[PDB]
Structures are given as C-alpha cells and as structure tokens.
Amino acid sequence: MKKTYRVTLTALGPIFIGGGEKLMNDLNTFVKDAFGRPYIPGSSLKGALRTAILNDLKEDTKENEVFAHLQVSDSETIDLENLKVYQKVDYSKTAKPLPLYRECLKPNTEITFTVSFDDEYLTLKKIQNALHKTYQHYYIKWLKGGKVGETLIKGVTFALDQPSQNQGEIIYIGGGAGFVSKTLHYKSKNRDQARNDSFDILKQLFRTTYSKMRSVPDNVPTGKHYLEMGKARIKLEEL
C-alpha cells in the first residue's frame, strides 16, 4: 500500500538530537541545514521506532527484514527563534544543575514529518500496541522503582499523563535524556533485568552502586513546570 503519514511532534521537553558540531559559558551548537536553519533528521525518528518495534533480543543486524521498508523522511525546517537556552539537572537526589549545558529546541515546537512505510510486515496495528507496550514498560520496568524509591517531594505542574490516553503513541528520541532512553532490552522481568544491565553498565565506568541509576528531567526558567524531556506526542494522519 505504501501508507504515507504526516506525523507531527510537539515537544514536552528540551530536545537536542546530537549534531556532532558541539563544543559556565560552554557555548554549544546544533545540527542545522546548509542555510543555518535547524531541523530534525529522520534517522532520529527511525531510531525511536527501532526502540518501538525492535524491543527484542540482539537481532538488530544486517539480516533484518522489517526496517528496510519503513521510509522515514526529514521534516520541515523551522527558524531559530524557536530556541531558548536551558539547563541540565539530574533528579536522583538533591537535584542540582550539572555543568553540561546545551543550546536546544524550545518545548512545544510543532515539527511535522513525511513518514511512510510498506505493508509487507509493517502496519499501525503493530505500531499502536508496540508503543503502548514500550510506554507501559517504561513505567513498570524502570520508572516505577524511581517513583517508589528515592523520590523527593520537589517533583510532585508535572504531568504523569498515564490516565490521559492509552493509545497516545508516545516515543522517546535521543536528546540527552539520560542513558535509559537509549535502551533496547526490557522484557520481561523487573529487578533481575535491572541488576543484569546494572553490571552491564558498571563494567563500563566506576560508580558506586545505588538505585535508581540516572533520571534526567528538566524545567523552565517564578513559574516552574518540572518538564521531563525526551518524550513527545505523535498524531498519525495520512498524507
């Protein structure tokens, strides 16, 4: 069928998709086009749908048969007045601005995408249930322990957004929203899998153990919002 969609992202948090050209001043730069006008490349959305569908064992290989057909294009190109400076804060305990800043996209930015995919193995029947599955396990596998354990009253304007819509089609794109948003294997147990990836992570660095690892929300610059970043809403309409 080649069912094309016009999906649109609205930003619940500050977002910074890599860039490569990146340097208390710490002046940063972002991915732009050749006209100096920012946009979001389609590989970010393809990685987000890789988190969505391929949440399984390590078969994410050149032998793959699903994601050669998922034809994600780029977006429309938005001017640079949709951009404010923001800060990095780690909400584990005693939340303080860490010295690692970024010039990033302003929240609630309307960006739209010409996303299409073939129907040989790919439908929205898969996308809907896979996104609800990944969202529900993003709470019940990692963030439920962050809700019940080592929780401070500063974070609870914050939207828990679980009674809102169970078919909300929510993804996570990689924008420095912790090293939990760049995962692939959460199936299907709670704490044995947690300690599994805990030694898998802690043989790559030197931290003393504590639960839970690293949750990175953000806020607004007195009005406060405690806006978690990395997540966005998607609509699915044809053409």
Partner: protein, 214 residues
C-alpha cells in the same frame, strides 16, 4: 526526427547517491556522493535515475512487489527502457543523460556549499556510546536540469509513453533517489517539465506538454 524532454529536478530533502572509496584521500568523509569528474560539482547519474525510475514503474504496473529481473518486465517498459533477449533483442527508446547542477550562482549568493555533510551519530546496545560518522549529501532545494531524449518510433504510442513518464515522475516525488534515503534523505520534486523537439513542430507538441504540465 526526435523530441527531447527538458526539465528540472529539485531536492526537497538532502539527497545521497553514488559512492567511492578512493586511494588518494578519504578525508573526514565516509561514503561520499557521486560527483561529476571534470566540473567537480555533484551529479545525478542517468543510470541512477533510470534504475529508480524503472523500479518505480515496476512497482506501478504490476503492483506491490514483483520479485522479477528487469529484462522480463512489462512490455511497455521493454519498449521504453530497453531489453536484451536471447537473440530477438527488443531495443530501447528512452535515453537518459548525466544530470549535473545548473544553479551554482544562486547558491553562491547565499554563501552555501554545493554539497552537504552531516554528523550522523549512532547509539549502540545499552552500553549507550555514540559512534559518530560523516556522510556527504547534497543540499535540498538545489536544482538539476535534465534533457531526456526520446526517439519517435511509434506515432500512436507516444501518448501512453509520456503519460507513464508523468506517472513515474509522480511516483518519484513520493520516494527517495538513491542513497541512505530510508532514514531521511533523497526526496525529490519535479518542475518546469517543458517539451521541445529538434526541428519542426510535428507529432503535436501541445498534448504532450499538457500531460507533462499536469
């Protein structure tokens, strides 16, 4: 005599096509774009345009999938893009040309390079370390004129031939043109599809110019 198909293909997304791993200097670019060799400026090959064009018509006529070799395609494609049978070879009518960039000056007014490089990062397994890499595309909005030559060998088939040329271009705006297009590259759009002939004004130009101006 012959009638040509002048036109202009533009890019609405940064397009990647071609490649080489050269001995002299790779530099800090992995998998570069195919470029013209004397004029040193980028180029859509006519081979690439023919291949993607034929694949899209193969998706159009026998719909969906084909799983078929391109010497035994549909008979109109065998007349248009050419075929080599065992001894009874059925020739081509459609000649493509190496499309090179024409609008250098209007990109030089804004101090914009002809090509585009992007830092395409890659996040691996839950160790979660970036694996940076650089690919070379050409910037969207750049224009590319083409002059496809069309030998008239059937007077009563050029209607359907130009209608499926327009059907193929219409199937090509909804697709990439080569390269790493599946993750946000390659999207094209056609404009200024004007038809002129070599000499005379025979095999009426008005109906073909209207069905390519649609």
């Amino acid at each position: 005599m012959k009638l040509v198909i002048e036109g202009t293909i533009v890019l609405k997304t940064g397009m990647h096509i071609g490649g080489s791993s050269d001995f002299s200097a790779i530099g800090a670019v992995a998998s570069p774009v195919v470029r013209d060799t004397l004029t040193r400026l980028p180029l859509i090959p006519g081979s690439s345009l023919k291949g993607k064009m034929r694949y899209l018509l193969a998706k159009e006529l026998n719909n969906g999938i084909l799983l078929n070799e391109p010497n035994n395609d549909q008979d109109e494609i065998l007349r248009l893009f050419g075929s080599s049978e065992k001894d009874k070879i059925r020739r081509a009518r459609l000649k493509f040309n190496d499309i090179k960039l024409s609008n250098l000056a209007e990109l030089e007014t804004f101090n914009v390079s002809s090509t585009e490089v992007k830092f395409e990062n890659t996040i691996n397994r839950k160790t979660a370390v970036a694996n940076p890499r650089q690919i070379e595309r050409v910037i969207a909005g750049s224009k590319f004129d083409f002059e496809i030559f069309y030998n008239l060998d059937d007077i009563k088939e050029v209607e359907k031939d130009f209608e499926n040329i327009k059907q193929g271009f219409d199937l090509l705006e909804f697709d990439y043109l080569g390269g790493h297009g599946t993750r946000g590259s390659g999207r094209i759009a056609f404009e200024n599809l004007s038809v002129i002939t070599a000499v005379g004004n025979f095999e009426k130009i008005n109906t073909l110019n209207e069905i390519l101006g649609a």
